[PDB]
Amino acid sequence: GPETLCGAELVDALQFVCGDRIVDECCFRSCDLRRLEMYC
Amino acid sequence: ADWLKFTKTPPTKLQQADGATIEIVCEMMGSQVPSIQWVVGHLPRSELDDLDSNQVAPSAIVRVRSSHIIDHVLSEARTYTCVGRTGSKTIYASTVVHPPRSSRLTPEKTYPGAQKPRIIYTEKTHLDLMGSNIQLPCRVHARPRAEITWLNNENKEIVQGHRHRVLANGDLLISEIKWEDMGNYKCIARNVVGKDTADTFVYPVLN
């Protein structure tokens, strides 16, 4: 659906992963874990 | 794989008011599809072994939120613990709930009457590979029992079809996810006396 909502909801997930365990790109087109990962 | 962590960990202690329903929320993120379950009291650590299926499925990443509703007045402090499992990993967070100093209601008896639905088990984020299948839950606490309806990313209601069905337990099954699928799906849980809703974000990842 909306690019905005995807981005909001994307960062909300990403917030957790990067610390321990671009948004626009992957909200407009499907990315893969490698690219998504380069959020940190 | 394999990893598992909390994203919303419950507070360790709570103070019950007289007559008021507590909802302990625990939320977590991890590889594949984490499973949460709650236990009451002190469980010896050896005791899990309480796992419910150990069946081999995906490279998905899920963020799943489960809540425990206490709707009766405790006559004595009690602990509720939520247990997370996925792959070879297990984690947990415990909360002690403390009874009121004084109470107008009977201890240990469930507040009577109807009750607004509450969605107690739901996925926040569910990322999986293209063409894979995903099954998004919605579980509920409701008296009377609650009807479940789902909407798609465009916010249209979902009806049964070749790629979408809602299962008997309210989970929504989406088959062969395509990029057109990415978005939010909303579970609407409803009864005579009210409603609740939850939102799940589906990101179909590439190759």
PDB file of all heavy atoms in Angstrom, chain A residues 21, chain B residues 1-6 28-37 51-55 57-64 83-92 121 123, unseen atoms left out:
ATOM      1  N   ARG A  21      20.500  -7.642  17.599  1.00  0.00           N
ATOM      2  CA  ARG A  21      19.963  -8.874  17.059  1.00  0.00           C
ATOM      3  C   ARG A  21      20.414 -10.081  17.895  1.00  0.00           C
ATOM      4  O   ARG A  21      19.714 -10.533  18.798  1.00  0.00           O
ATOM      5  CB  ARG A  21      20.321  -9.009  15.575  1.00  0.00           C
ATOM      6  CG  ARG A  21      21.398 -10.012  15.224  1.00  0.00           C
ATOM      7  CD  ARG A  21      21.058 -10.708  13.936  1.00  0.00           C
ATOM      8  NE  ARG A  21      20.623  -9.757  12.934  1.00  0.00           N
ATOM      9  CZ  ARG A  21      19.885 -10.085  11.886  1.00  0.00           C
ATOM     10  NH1 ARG A  21      19.513 -11.336  11.720  1.00  0.00           N
ATOM     11  NH2 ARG A  21      19.520  -9.172  11.007  1.00  0.00           N
TER      12      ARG A  21
ATOM     13  N   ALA B   1      19.295 -17.666  10.453  1.00  0.00           N
ATOM     14  CA  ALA B   1      18.998 -18.142  11.834  1.00  0.00           C
ATOM     15  C   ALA B   1      20.315 -18.355  12.550  1.00  0.00           C
ATOM     16  O   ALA B   1      21.348 -18.526  11.896  1.00  0.00           O
ATOM     17  CB  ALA B   1      18.200 -19.440  11.794  1.00  0.00           C
ATOM     18  N   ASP B   2      20.298 -18.385  13.877  1.00  0.00           N
ATOM     19  CA  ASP B   2      19.078 -18.351  14.683  1.00  0.00           C
ATOM     20  C   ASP B   2      19.201 -17.173  15.615  1.00  0.00           C
ATOM     21  O   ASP B   2      20.271 -16.909  16.174  1.00  0.00           O
ATOM     22  CB  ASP B   2      18.871 -19.668  15.469  1.00  0.00           C
ATOM     23  CG  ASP B   2      20.149 -20.518  15.561  1.00  0.00           C
ATOM     24  OD1 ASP B   2      20.487 -21.189  14.566  1.00  0.00           O
ATOM     25  OD2 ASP B   2      20.824 -20.521  16.612  1.00  0.00           O
ATOM     26  N   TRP B   3      18.117 -16.437  15.775  1.00  0.00           N
ATOM     27  CA  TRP B   3      18.142 -15.356  16.737  1.00  0.00           C
ATOM     28  C   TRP B   3      16.748 -15.046  17.228  1.00  0.00           C
ATOM     29  O   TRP B   3      15.765 -15.338  16.547  1.00  0.00           O
ATOM     30  CB  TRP B   3      18.812 -14.118  16.145  1.00  0.00           C
ATOM     31  CG  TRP B   3      18.081 -13.547  15.015  1.00  0.00           C
ATOM     32  CD1 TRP B   3      18.048 -14.021  13.751  1.00  0.00           C
ATOM     33  CD2 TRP B   3      17.247 -12.382  15.036  1.00  0.00           C
ATOM     34  NE1 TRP B   3      17.258 -13.219  12.970  1.00  0.00           N
ATOM     35  CE2 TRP B   3      16.761 -12.197  13.732  1.00  0.00           C
ATOM     36  CE3 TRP B   3      16.870 -11.481  16.028  1.00  0.00           C
ATOM     37  CZ2 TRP B   3      15.915 -11.142  13.389  1.00  0.00           C
ATOM     38  CZ3 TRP B   3      16.037 -10.427  15.681  1.00  0.00           C
ATOM     39  CH2 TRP B   3      15.568 -10.274  14.379  1.00  0.00           C
ATOM     40  N   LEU B   4      16.689 -14.439  18.410  1.00  0.00           N
ATOM     41  CA  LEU B   4      15.427 -14.160  19.067  1.00  0.00           C
ATOM     42  C   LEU B   4      15.668 -13.090  20.098  1.00  0.00           C
ATOM     43  O   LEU B   4      16.558 -13.213  20.892  1.00  0.00           O
ATOM     44  CB  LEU B   4      14.948 -15.444  19.733  1.00  0.00           C
ATOM     45  CG  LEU B   4      13.605 -15.449  20.430  1.00  0.00           C
ATOM     46  CD1 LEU B   4      12.463 -15.322  19.431  1.00  0.00           C
ATOM     47  CD2 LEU B   4      13.502 -16.752  21.228  1.00  0.00           C
ATOM     48  N   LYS B   5      14.882 -12.029  20.085  1.00  0.00           N
ATOM     49  CA  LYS B   5      15.000 -11.016  21.115  1.00  0.00           C
ATOM     50  C   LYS B   5      13.677 -10.350  21.418  1.00  0.00           C
ATOM     51  O   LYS B   5      12.763 -10.398  20.624  1.00  0.00           O
ATOM     52  CB  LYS B   5      16.029  -9.970  20.727  1.00  0.00           C
ATOM     53  CG  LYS B   5      15.662  -9.183  19.493  1.00  0.00           C
ATOM     54  CD  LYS B   5      16.765  -8.236  19.073  1.00  0.00           C
ATOM     55  CE  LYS B   5      16.516  -6.846  19.611  1.00  0.00           C
ATOM     56  NZ  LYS B   5      17.666  -5.951  19.345  1.00  0.00           N
ATOM     57  N   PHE B   6      13.589  -9.739  22.589  1.00  0.00           N
ATOM     58  CA  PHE B   6      12.424  -8.984  22.998  1.00  0.00           C
ATOM     59  C   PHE B   6      12.502  -7.634  22.360  1.00  0.00           C
ATOM     60  O   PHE B   6      13.579  -7.099  22.195  1.00  0.00           O
ATOM     61  CB  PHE B   6      12.441  -8.745  24.498  1.00  0.00           C
ATOM     62  CG  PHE B   6      11.997  -9.922  25.306  1.00  0.00           C
ATOM     63  CD1 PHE B   6      12.918 -10.680  26.037  1.00  0.00           C
ATOM     64  CD2 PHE B   6      10.669 -10.262  25.348  1.00  0.00           C
ATOM     65  CE1 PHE B   6      12.504 -11.770  26.778  1.00  0.00           C
ATOM     66  CE2 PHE B   6      10.244 -11.346  26.074  1.00  0.00           C
ATOM     67  CZ  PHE B   6      11.154 -12.098  26.796  1.00  0.00           C
ATOM     68  N   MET B  28       8.209  -9.676  20.706  1.00  0.00           N
ATOM     69  CA  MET B  28       9.537 -10.121  20.371  1.00  0.00           C
ATOM     70  C   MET B  28       9.722 -10.342  18.899  1.00  0.00           C
ATOM     71  O   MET B  28       8.761 -10.444  18.140  1.00  0.00           O
ATOM     72  CB  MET B  28       9.906 -11.374  21.152  1.00  0.00           C
ATOM     73  CG  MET B  28       8.753 -12.324  21.407  1.00  0.00           C
ATOM     74  SD  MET B  28       9.361 -13.867  22.127  1.00  0.00           S
ATOM     75  CE  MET B  28       8.763 -13.704  23.818  1.00  0.00           C
ATOM     76  N   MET B  29      10.992 -10.366  18.509  1.00  0.00           N
ATOM     77  CA  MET B  29      11.378 -10.452  17.116  1.00  0.00           C
ATOM     78  C   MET B  29      12.405 -11.547  17.000  1.00  0.00           C
ATOM     79  O   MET B  29      13.222 -11.742  17.917  1.00  0.00           O
ATOM     80  CB  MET B  29      11.979  -9.130  16.663  1.00  0.00           C
ATOM     81  CG  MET B  29      12.073  -9.039  15.157  1.00  0.00           C
ATOM     82  SD  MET B  29      12.288  -7.342  14.604  1.00  0.00           S
ATOM     83  CE  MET B  29      11.617  -7.437  12.955  1.00  0.00           C
ATOM     84  N   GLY B  30      12.372 -12.256  15.888  1.00  0.00           N
ATOM     85  CA  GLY B  30      13.336 -13.320  15.677  1.00  0.00           C
ATOM     86  C   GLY B  30      13.237 -14.011  14.337  1.00  0.00           C
ATOM     87  O   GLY B  30      12.343 -13.729  13.531  1.00  0.00           O
ATOM     88  N   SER B  31      14.162 -14.932  14.105  1.00  0.00           N
ATOM     89  CA  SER B  31      14.206 -15.662  12.843  1.00  0.00           C
ATOM     90  C   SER B  31      13.000 -16.548  12.716  1.00  0.00           C
ATOM     91  O   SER B  31      12.380 -16.878  13.685  1.00  0.00           O
ATOM     92  CB  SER B  31      15.494 -16.499  12.717  1.00  0.00           C
ATOM     93  OG  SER B  31      15.721 -17.342  13.854  1.00  0.00           O
ATOM     94  N   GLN B  32      12.675 -16.914  11.496  1.00  0.00           N
ATOM     95  CA  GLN B  32      11.552 -17.744  11.222  1.00  0.00           C
ATOM     96  C   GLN B  32      10.349 -17.230  11.962  1.00  0.00           C
ATOM     97  O   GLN B  32      10.071 -16.048  11.882  1.00  0.00           O
ATOM     98  CB  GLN B  32      11.873 -19.179  11.567  1.00  0.00           C
ATOM     99  CG  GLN B  32      12.672 -19.328  12.829  1.00  0.00           C
ATOM    100  CD  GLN B  32      13.837 -20.222  12.616  1.00  0.00           C
ATOM    101  OE1 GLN B  32      13.702 -21.447  12.652  1.00  0.00           O
ATOM    102  NE2 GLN B  32      14.992 -19.630  12.383  1.00  0.00           N
ATOM    103  N   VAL B  33       9.611 -18.097  12.653  1.00  0.00           N
ATOM    104  CA  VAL B  33       8.413 -17.654  13.319  1.00  0.00           C
ATOM    105  C   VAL B  33       8.431 -18.015  14.779  1.00  0.00           C
ATOM    106  O   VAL B  33       8.121 -19.132  15.152  1.00  0.00           O
ATOM    107  CB  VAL B  33       7.150 -18.231  12.684  1.00  0.00           C
ATOM    108  CG1 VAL B  33       5.897 -17.565  13.279  1.00  0.00           C
ATOM    109  CG2 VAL B  33       7.203 -18.036  11.175  1.00  0.00           C
ATOM    110  N   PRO B  34       8.783 -17.049  15.619  1.00  0.00           N
ATOM    111  CA  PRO B  34       8.721 -17.222  17.040  1.00  0.00           C
ATOM    112  C   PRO B  34       7.349 -17.566  17.560  1.00  0.00           C
ATOM    113  O   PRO B  34       6.298 -17.202  16.961  1.00  0.00           O
ATOM    114  CB  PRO B  34       9.139 -15.852  17.560  1.00  0.00           C
ATOM    115  CG  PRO B  34      10.157 -15.457  16.588  1.00  0.00           C
ATOM    116  CD  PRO B  34       9.473 -15.796  15.292  1.00  0.00           C
ATOM    117  N   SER B  35       7.379 -18.278  18.679  1.00  0.00           N
ATOM    118  CA  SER B  35       6.165 -18.729  19.315  1.00  0.00           C
ATOM    119  C   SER B  35       6.259 -18.301  20.765  1.00  0.00           C
ATOM    120  O   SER B  35       7.265 -18.515  21.437  1.00  0.00           O
ATOM    121  CB  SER B  35       5.960 -20.253  19.159  1.00  0.00           C
ATOM    122  OG  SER B  35       6.430 -20.977  20.291  1.00  0.00           O
ATOM    123  N   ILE B  36       5.190 -17.687  21.229  1.00  0.00           N
ATOM    124  CA  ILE B  36       5.091 -17.221  22.616  1.00  0.00           C
ATOM    125  C   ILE B  36       4.005 -17.973  23.335  1.00  0.00           C
ATOM    126  O   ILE B  36       2.959 -18.300  22.779  1.00  0.00           O
ATOM    127  CB  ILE B  36       4.727 -15.738  22.671  1.00  0.00           C
ATOM    128  CG1 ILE B  36       5.646 -14.947  21.761  1.00  0.00           C
ATOM    129  CG2 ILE B  36       4.906 -15.191  24.064  1.00  0.00           C
ATOM    130  CD1 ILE B  36       5.365 -13.480  21.758  1.00  0.00           C
ATOM    131  N   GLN B  37       4.247 -18.246  24.588  1.00  0.00           N
ATOM    132  CA  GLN B  37       3.229 -18.875  25.396  1.00  0.00           C
ATOM    133  C   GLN B  37       3.441 -18.300  26.773  1.00  0.00           C
ATOM    134  O   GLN B  37       4.500 -17.780  27.044  1.00  0.00           O
ATOM    135  CB  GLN B  37       3.364 -20.406  25.297  1.00  0.00           C
ATOM    136  CG  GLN B  37       3.761 -21.101  26.589  1.00  0.00           C
ATOM    137  CD  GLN B  37       4.735 -22.233  26.383  1.00  0.00           C
ATOM    138  OE1 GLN B  37       5.317 -22.382  25.306  1.00  0.00           O
ATOM    139  NE2 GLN B  37       4.952 -23.021  27.435  1.00  0.00           N
ATOM    140  N   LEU B  51       7.048 -26.952  24.909  1.00  0.00           N
ATOM    141  CA  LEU B  51       6.974 -26.589  23.509  1.00  0.00           C
ATOM    142  C   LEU B  51       5.834 -27.365  22.887  1.00  0.00           C
ATOM    143  O   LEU B  51       5.441 -28.416  23.401  1.00  0.00           O
ATOM    144  CB  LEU B  51       8.298 -26.945  22.828  1.00  0.00           C
ATOM    145  CG  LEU B  51       8.777 -26.009  21.737  1.00  0.00           C
ATOM    146  CD1 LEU B  51      10.099 -26.472  21.107  1.00  0.00           C
ATOM    147  CD2 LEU B  51       7.703 -25.818  20.692  1.00  0.00           C
ATOM    148  N   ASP B  52       5.274 -26.859  21.809  1.00  0.00           N
ATOM    149  CA  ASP B  52       4.056 -27.439  21.306  1.00  0.00           C
ATOM    150  C   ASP B  52       4.128 -28.083  19.944  1.00  0.00           C
ATOM    151  O   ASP B  52       3.350 -28.979  19.670  1.00  0.00           O
ATOM    152  CB  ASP B  52       2.986 -26.373  21.381  1.00  0.00           C
ATOM    153  CG  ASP B  52       2.970 -25.727  22.733  1.00  0.00           C
ATOM    154  OD1 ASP B  52       3.179 -26.472  23.725  1.00  0.00           O
ATOM    155  OD2 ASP B  52       2.799 -24.487  22.809  1.00  0.00           O
ATOM    156  N   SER B  53       5.027 -27.641  19.080  1.00  0.00           N
ATOM    157  CA  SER B  53       5.340 -28.428  17.897  1.00  0.00           C
ATOM    158  C   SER B  53       6.794 -28.191  17.620  1.00  0.00           C
ATOM    159  O   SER B  53       7.271 -27.079  17.751  1.00  0.00           O
ATOM    160  CB  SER B  53       4.474 -28.036  16.688  1.00  0.00           C
ATOM    161  OG  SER B  53       4.261 -29.169  15.865  1.00  0.00           O
ATOM    162  N   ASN B  54       7.502 -29.249  17.274  1.00  0.00           N
ATOM    163  CA  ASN B  54       8.861 -29.110  16.820  1.00  0.00           C
ATOM    164  C   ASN B  54       8.907 -29.738  15.437  1.00  0.00           C
ATOM    165  O   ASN B  54       9.469 -30.797  15.225  1.00  0.00           O
ATOM    166  CB  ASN B  54       9.828 -29.788  17.775  1.00  0.00           C
ATOM    167  CG  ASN B  54       9.332 -29.806  19.207  1.00  0.00           C
ATOM    168  OD1 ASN B  54       8.116 -29.785  19.472  1.00  0.00           O
ATOM    169  ND2 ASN B  54      10.278 -29.889  20.156  1.00  0.00           N
ATOM    170  N   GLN B  55       8.270 -29.061  14.503  1.00  0.00           N
ATOM    171  CA  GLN B  55       8.206 -29.468  13.129  1.00  0.00           C
ATOM    172  C   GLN B  55       9.217 -28.603  12.378  1.00  0.00           C
ATOM    173  O   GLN B  55       9.451 -27.445  12.743  1.00  0.00           O
ATOM    174  CB  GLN B  55       6.791 -29.249  12.580  1.00  0.00           C
ATOM    175  N   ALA B  57      10.576 -24.839   7.763  1.00  0.00           N
ATOM    176  CA  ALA B  57       9.618 -24.209   6.846  1.00  0.00           C
ATOM    177  C   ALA B  57      10.131 -22.926   6.125  1.00  0.00           C
ATOM    178  O   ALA B  57       9.885 -22.728   4.951  1.00  0.00           O
ATOM    179  N   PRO B  58      10.725 -21.994   6.865  1.00  0.00           N
ATOM    180  CA  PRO B  58      11.157 -20.756   6.204  1.00  0.00           C
ATOM    181  C   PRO B  58      12.415 -19.979   6.663  1.00  0.00           C
ATOM    182  O   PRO B  58      13.039 -20.282   7.665  1.00  0.00           O
ATOM    183  CB  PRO B  58       9.932 -19.872   6.420  1.00  0.00           C
ATOM    184  CG  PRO B  58       9.455 -20.274   7.783  1.00  0.00           C
ATOM    185  CD  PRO B  58       9.740 -21.745   7.933  1.00  0.00           C
ATOM    186  N   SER B  59      12.733 -18.938   5.902  1.00  0.00           N
ATOM    187  CA  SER B  59      13.751 -17.961   6.262  1.00  0.00           C
ATOM    188  C   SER B  59      13.060 -16.634   6.585  1.00  0.00           C
ATOM    189  O   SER B  59      13.587 -15.553   6.335  1.00  0.00           O
ATOM    190  CB  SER B  59      14.707 -17.774   5.087  1.00  0.00           C
ATOM    191  OG  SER B  59      15.995 -17.440   5.554  1.00  0.00           O
ATOM    192  N   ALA B  60      11.865 -16.719   7.146  1.00  0.00           N
ATOM    193  CA  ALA B  60      11.098 -15.527   7.481  1.00  0.00           C
ATOM    194  C   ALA B  60      11.637 -14.860   8.731  1.00  0.00           C
ATOM    195  O   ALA B  60      12.386 -15.482   9.491  1.00  0.00           O
ATOM    196  CB  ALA B  60       9.640 -15.885   7.694  1.00  0.00           C
ATOM    197  N   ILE B  61      11.245 -13.603   8.938  1.00  0.00           N
ATOM    198  CA  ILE B  61      11.530 -12.885  10.172  1.00  0.00           C
ATOM    199  C   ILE B  61      10.244 -12.291  10.727  1.00  0.00           C
ATOM    200  O   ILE B  61       9.572 -11.522  10.046  1.00  0.00           O
ATOM    201  CB  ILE B  61      12.531 -11.767   9.919  1.00  0.00           C
ATOM    202  CG1 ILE B  61      13.879 -12.388   9.548  1.00  0.00           C
ATOM    203  CG2 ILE B  61      12.675 -10.863  11.151  1.00  0.00           C
ATOM    204  CD1 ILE B  61      14.767 -11.444   8.784  1.00  0.00           C
ATOM    205  N   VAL B  62       9.921 -12.605  11.976  1.00  0.00           N
ATOM    206  CA  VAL B  62       8.641 -12.227  12.522  1.00  0.00           C
ATOM    207  C   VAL B  62       8.797 -11.458  13.796  1.00  0.00           C
ATOM    208  O   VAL B  62       9.718 -11.679  14.565  1.00  0.00           O
ATOM    209  CB  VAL B  62       7.766 -13.462  12.811  1.00  0.00           C
ATOM    210  CG1 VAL B  62       6.463 -13.071  13.504  1.00  0.00           C
ATOM    211  CG2 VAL B  62       7.462 -14.217  11.529  1.00  0.00           C
ATOM    212  N   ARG B  63       7.869 -10.534  14.014  1.00  0.00           N
ATOM    213  CA  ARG B  63       7.790  -9.771  15.255  1.00  0.00           C
ATOM    214  C   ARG B  63       6.401 -10.050  15.748  1.00  0.00           C
ATOM    215  O   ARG B  63       5.435  -9.715  15.068  1.00  0.00           O
ATOM    216  CB  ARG B  63       7.960  -8.312  14.905  1.00  0.00           C
ATOM    217  CG  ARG B  63       8.057  -7.347  16.045  1.00  0.00           C
ATOM    218  CD  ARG B  63       8.581  -6.056  15.483  1.00  0.00           C
ATOM    219  NE  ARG B  63       8.014  -4.894  16.155  1.00  0.00           N
ATOM    220  CZ  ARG B  63       7.322  -3.921  15.570  1.00  0.00           C
ATOM    221  NH1 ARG B  63       7.088  -3.926  14.270  1.00  0.00           N
ATOM    222  NH2 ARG B  63       6.880  -2.910  16.305  1.00  0.00           N
ATOM    223  N   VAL B  64       6.269 -10.699  16.902  1.00  0.00           N
ATOM    224  CA  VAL B  64       4.955 -11.187  17.315  1.00  0.00           C
ATOM    225  C   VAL B  64       4.668 -10.701  18.699  1.00  0.00           C
ATOM    226  O   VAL B  64       5.544 -10.677  19.509  1.00  0.00           O
ATOM    227  CB  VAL B  64       4.893 -12.730  17.173  1.00  0.00           C
ATOM    228  CG1 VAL B  64       6.178 -13.378  17.647  1.00  0.00           C
ATOM    229  CG2 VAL B  64       3.712 -13.319  17.904  1.00  0.00           C
ATOM    230  N   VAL B  83       7.003 -16.908  27.510  1.00  0.00           N
ATOM    231  CA  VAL B  83       8.104 -17.651  26.982  1.00  0.00           C
ATOM    232  C   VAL B  83       8.176 -17.634  25.464  1.00  0.00           C
ATOM    233  O   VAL B  83       7.211 -18.002  24.783  1.00  0.00           O
ATOM    234  CB  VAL B  83       7.999 -19.084  27.475  1.00  0.00           C
ATOM    235  CG1 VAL B  83       9.149 -19.910  26.920  1.00  0.00           C
ATOM    236  CG2 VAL B  83       7.955 -19.075  29.008  1.00  0.00           C
ATOM    237  N   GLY B  84       9.337 -17.203  24.952  1.00  0.00           N
ATOM    238  CA  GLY B  84       9.614 -17.151  23.506  1.00  0.00           C
ATOM    239  C   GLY B  84      10.506 -18.274  23.013  1.00  0.00           C
ATOM    240  O   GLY B  84      11.544 -18.584  23.605  1.00  0.00           O
ATOM    241  N   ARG B  85      10.101 -18.894  21.929  1.00  0.00           N
ATOM    242  CA  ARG B  85      10.852 -19.996  21.345  1.00  0.00           C
ATOM    243  C   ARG B  85      10.948 -19.784  19.844  1.00  0.00           C
ATOM    244  O   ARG B  85      10.012 -19.297  19.209  1.00  0.00           O
ATOM    245  CB  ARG B  85      10.152 -21.332  21.619  1.00  0.00           C
ATOM    246  CG  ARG B  85      10.440 -21.915  22.994  1.00  0.00           C
ATOM    247  CD  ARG B  85       9.623 -23.166  23.247  1.00  0.00           C
ATOM    248  NE  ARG B  85       9.250 -23.282  24.653  1.00  0.00           N
ATOM    249  CZ  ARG B  85       8.013 -23.147  25.141  1.00  0.00           C
ATOM    250  NH1 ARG B  85       6.969 -22.920  24.344  1.00  0.00           N
ATOM    251  NH2 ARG B  85       7.822 -23.261  26.449  1.00  0.00           N
ATOM    252  N   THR B  86      12.095 -20.126  19.282  1.00  0.00           N
ATOM    253  CA  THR B  86      12.243 -20.235  17.836  1.00  0.00           C
ATOM    254  C   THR B  86      13.562 -20.929  17.635  1.00  0.00           C
ATOM    255  O   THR B  86      14.518 -20.671  18.392  1.00  0.00           O
ATOM    256  CB  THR B  86      12.225 -18.872  17.080  1.00  0.00           C
ATOM    257  OG1 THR B  86      12.001 -19.111  15.688  1.00  0.00           O
ATOM    258  CG2 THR B  86      13.517 -18.078  17.240  1.00  0.00           C
ATOM    259  N   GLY B  87      13.604 -21.821  16.643  1.00  0.00           N
ATOM    260  CA  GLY B  87      14.787 -22.636  16.379  1.00  0.00           C
ATOM    261  C   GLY B  87      15.277 -23.278  17.653  1.00  0.00           C
ATOM    262  O   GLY B  87      14.507 -23.932  18.357  1.00  0.00           O
ATOM    263  N   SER B  88      16.540 -23.026  17.977  1.00  0.00           N
ATOM    264  CA  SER B  88      17.162 -23.590  19.162  1.00  0.00           C
ATOM    265  C   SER B  88      17.155 -22.638  20.345  1.00  0.00           C
ATOM    266  O   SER B  88      17.719 -22.954  21.380  1.00  0.00           O
ATOM    267  CB  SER B  88      18.614 -23.948  18.839  1.00  0.00           C
ATOM    268  OG  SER B  88      19.437 -22.786  18.860  1.00  0.00           O
ATOM    269  N   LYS B  89      16.535 -21.473  20.204  1.00  0.00           N
ATOM    270  CA  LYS B  89      16.621 -20.456  21.247  1.00  0.00           C
ATOM    271  C   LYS B  89      15.354 -20.356  22.087  1.00  0.00           C
ATOM    272  O   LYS B  89      14.241 -20.539  21.586  1.00  0.00           O
ATOM    273  CB  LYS B  89      16.963 -19.093  20.638  1.00  0.00           C
ATOM    274  CG  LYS B  89      18.429 -18.694  20.795  1.00  0.00           C
ATOM    275  CD  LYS B  89      19.228 -18.761  19.494  1.00  0.00           C
ATOM    276  CE  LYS B  89      20.465 -19.664  19.588  1.00  0.00           C
ATOM    277  NZ  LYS B  89      21.545 -19.170  20.492  1.00  0.00           N
ATOM    278  N   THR B  90      15.548 -20.066  23.371  1.00  0.00           N
ATOM    279  CA  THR B  90      14.452 -19.783  24.287  1.00  0.00           C
ATOM    280  C   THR B  90      14.747 -18.553  25.160  1.00  0.00           C
ATOM    281  O   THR B  90      15.810 -18.453  25.748  1.00  0.00           O
ATOM    282  CB  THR B  90      14.193 -20.985  25.198  1.00  0.00           C
ATOM    283  OG1 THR B  90      14.127 -22.179  24.406  1.00  0.00           O
ATOM    284  CG2 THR B  90      12.882 -20.802  25.976  1.00  0.00           C
ATOM    285  N   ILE B  91      13.809 -17.615  25.239  1.00  0.00           N
ATOM    286  CA  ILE B  91      13.939 -16.466  26.153  1.00  0.00           C
ATOM    287  C   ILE B  91      12.657 -16.263  26.952  1.00  0.00           C
ATOM    288  O   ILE B  91      11.628 -16.848  26.617  1.00  0.00           O
ATOM    289  CB  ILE B  91      14.270 -15.170  25.389  1.00  0.00           C
ATOM    290  CG1 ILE B  91      13.070 -14.723  24.556  1.00  0.00           C
ATOM    291  CG2 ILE B  91      15.477 -15.378  24.485  1.00  0.00           C
ATOM    292  CD1 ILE B  91      13.332 -13.519  23.706  1.00  0.00           C
ATOM    293  N   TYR B  92      12.724 -15.438  28.003  1.00  0.00           N
ATOM    294  CA  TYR B  92      11.557 -15.152  28.860  1.00  0.00           C
ATOM    295  C   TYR B  92      11.671 -13.904  29.743  1.00  0.00           C
ATOM    296  O   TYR B  92      12.744 -13.470  30.127  1.00  0.00           O
ATOM    297  CB  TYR B  92      11.244 -16.350  29.733  1.00  0.00           C
ATOM    298  CG  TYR B  92      12.455 -16.868  30.445  1.00  0.00           C
ATOM    299  CD1 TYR B  92      12.765 -16.435  31.723  1.00  0.00           C
ATOM    300  CD2 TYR B  92      13.306 -17.778  29.827  1.00  0.00           C
ATOM    301  CE1 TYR B  92      13.882 -16.901  32.378  1.00  0.00           C
ATOM    302  CE2 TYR B  92      14.431 -18.244  30.473  1.00  0.00           C
ATOM    303  CZ  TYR B  92      14.709 -17.806  31.749  1.00  0.00           C
ATOM    304  OH  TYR B  92      15.820 -18.270  32.397  1.00  0.00           O
ATOM    305  N   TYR B 121      -2.962 -12.243  20.560  1.00  0.00           N
ATOM    306  CA  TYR B 121      -1.812 -12.850  19.890  1.00  0.00           C
ATOM    307  C   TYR B 121      -1.833 -12.369  18.483  1.00  0.00           C
ATOM    308  O   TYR B 121      -2.830 -12.517  17.808  1.00  0.00           O
ATOM    309  CB  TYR B 121      -1.928 -14.374  19.899  1.00  0.00           C
ATOM    310  CG  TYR B 121      -0.625 -15.075  19.614  1.00  0.00           C
ATOM    311  CD1 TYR B 121       0.133 -15.599  20.636  1.00  0.00           C
ATOM    312  CD2 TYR B 121      -0.143 -15.195  18.322  1.00  0.00           C
ATOM    313  CE1 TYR B 121       1.333 -16.229  20.381  1.00  0.00           C
ATOM    314  CE2 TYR B 121       1.055 -15.798  18.074  1.00  0.00           C
ATOM    315  CZ  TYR B 121       1.768 -16.304  19.097  1.00  0.00           C
ATOM    316  OH  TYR B 121       2.930 -16.909  18.836  1.00  0.00           O
ATOM    317  N   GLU B 123       0.827 -10.832  14.993  1.00  0.00           N
ATOM    318  CA  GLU B 123       2.139 -10.537  14.433  1.00  0.00           C
ATOM    319  C   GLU B 123       2.184  -9.070  14.006  1.00  0.00           C
ATOM    320  O   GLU B 123       1.295  -8.583  13.292  1.00  0.00           O
ATOM    321  CB  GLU B 123       2.450 -11.452  13.236  1.00  0.00           C
ATOM    322  CG  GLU B 123       2.618 -12.896  13.647  1.00  0.00           C
ATOM    323  CD  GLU B 123       2.967 -13.828  12.505  1.00  0.00           C
ATOM    324  OE1 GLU B 123       2.945 -13.354  11.341  1.00  0.00           O
ATOM    325  OE2 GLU B 123       3.266 -15.028  12.783  1.00  0.00           O
TER     326      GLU B 123
END
